[PDB]
């Protein structure tokens, strides 16, 4: 299943979650994690795991892997999750997100 992992502009976590949901619905085999930088070094995270994915791949665990790296927190379910953190290293956050997904798919 395809994978979208990216850093994007968004005005709120609610918008970010809704964008993730629409991407997953428009291409239902896809799993998606978006990170959105915000002021003061904060970064928002929203993700969603495709319904067809391997059962060991859960959204909460994915978000936690990324947000814990960013000194933050995550919450959610096996299907959708969110979190926040702060970081100056978007490349590292993206790499954790992509490598985690590839290891669980
Ligand atoms: Ca499957």
Numbering used by the authors: 881 to 985
Give the text the authors published on this PDB structure.
The model suggested two major contact sites between mt C-Ala and mt tRNAAla. One is in the C-terminal α/β-globular subdomain (aa 873 to C-terminus) containing the glycine-rich “GG” motif. Thus, adaptive evolution of the Hs mt AlaRS/tRNAAla recognition system was accompanied by a radical reorganization of its recognition system, moving the center for tRNA recognition from sequence-specific (G3:U70) readout in the acceptor stem to C-Ala-mediated sequence-unspecific readout of the tRNA’s elbow structure.
Consistent with its absence from primate mt tRNAAla sequences, the human mt AlaRS/tRNAAla system was recently shown to be insensitive to a G3:U70 identity element. For the human mt AlaRS/tRNAAla system we show that loss of the G3:U70 identity element was accompanied by a radical reorganization of the recognition mechanism, away from sequence-specific direct readout in the acceptor stem to sequence-unspecific structural readout of the flexible tRNA elbow. The appended C-Ala domain, which plays an auxiliary role in prokaryotic AlaRSs and is dispensable for aminoacylation in the human cytoplasmic AlaRS system, plays a central role as a folding aid for the intrinsically flexible mt tRNA elbow. Fine-tuned induced-fit adaptation selects mt tRNAAla and rejects non-cognate mt tRNAs.
